[PDB]
Amino acid sequence: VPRGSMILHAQAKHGKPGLPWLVFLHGFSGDCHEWQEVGEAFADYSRLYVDLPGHGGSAAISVDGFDDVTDLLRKTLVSYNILDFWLVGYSLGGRVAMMAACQGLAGLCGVIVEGGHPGLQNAEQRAEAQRSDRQWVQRFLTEPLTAVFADWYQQPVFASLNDDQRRELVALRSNNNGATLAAMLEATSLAVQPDLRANLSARTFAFYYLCGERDSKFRALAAELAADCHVIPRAGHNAHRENPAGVIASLAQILRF
Ligand SMILES: [Cl-]
């Protein structure tokens, strides 16, 4: 899609008429293929595998903040004539999902967030994040990505990963435009995201949390939310990648009931 595209790039897959859409949102540096292994177990549903700004086919789409990502999401949904939908988001995508849900997306059935941060409490926690994210923006923007990603996957959230998993992920994410990656990282930084705890409780939509059992960080964060948390065994932050069958199982419990 071009630089100034009104809608995000996404891969649509049609399912049974009358079943809601499953709108899948990848994490930072991923693309629309992220949730395809898990989503394809739900092929009776219509699936929208979105490319977030700066990622995959949405690489040229530029955003200032979350309001812009939400608008784009809204326009993309209208574009595919999606009125009944679920937002299934991993990490950055989970954060995008929660942000869009709390701004208000008409037709939203529910949000399923996997390792998504509900938001930091004060502007001090935000400052610490702005400082750390300003450092990441600079590296993605100027350095070779095989180098930035090797350290990115060395971050505490990815501690649970083995060196073979980190190798495969570094290679996979390095197929990206650092400049557009960096812009999105800055646009939707934890530093600029509000505390969504009250908003995620005072919701009109259904809300479910998924978490790898090894992801102690997001397990504790989930515990603070008014949501059904589904702890995915033998899995880290990206639980759908490490354990796709377990995440399908959890999604089946959620969606097929
Ligand atoms: Cl990842």
Numbering used by the authors: -4 to 252
Cite, word for word, the article reporting this structure.
Re-annotation of the activity of an earlier enzyme in the pathway, MenD, then led to the recognition that the true enzymatic activity of MenH is to covert the MenD reaction product, 2-succinyl-5-enolpyruvyl-6-hydroxy-3-cyclohexene-1-carboxylate (SEPHCHC) to 2-succinyl-6-hydroxy-2,4-cyclohexadiene-1-carboxylate (SHCHC) by a 2,5 elimination of pyruvate from the cyclohexene ring. MenH is thus correctly annotated as SHCHC synthase. EcMenH adopts a typical α/β-hydrolase fold, comprising a core β-sheet of mostly parallel strands surrounded on both sides by α-helices. As is characteristic of the α/β-hydrolases the three catalytic triad residues (Ser86, His232, Asp210) are located on loops of the core α/β–domain.
Accordingly, we report the structure of the MenH from E. coli at 2.75 Å resolution, along with the structures of two active site mutant enzymes, Arg124Ala and Tyr85Phe, both at 2.5 Å resolution. Structural comparisons of native EcMenH with the two mutant structures, R124A and Y85F using SSM shows they overlay very closely, with rms differences of 0.26–0.61 Å in Cα-atom positions over the entire structure. This shows that the mutations do not affect the polypeptide conformation significantly. The active sites differ very little, apart from weaker density for the sulfate ion in the R124A structure, due to the loss of the Arg124 interactions. Arg124 is held in place by a hydrogen bond between NE and the carboxyl group of Asp128, but has its NH1 and NH2 groups pointing out into the middle of the cavity. The sulfate ion forms hydrogen bonded ion pairs with both Arg90 and Arg124, which appear to be the primary determinants of binding. The main difference for the R124A mutant is that much more variability is seen in the orientation of the pyruvate group, with the loss of the guanidinium group of Arg124. Two conserved basic residues, Arg90 and Arg124, are in position to bind the carboxyl groups of the enol-pyruvyl group and the cyclohexenyl ring, with Arg90 having a particularly important role. Arg124 projects out into the active site from the lid domain, held in position by a hydrogen bond with Asp128. The structure is not perturbed by the mutations.
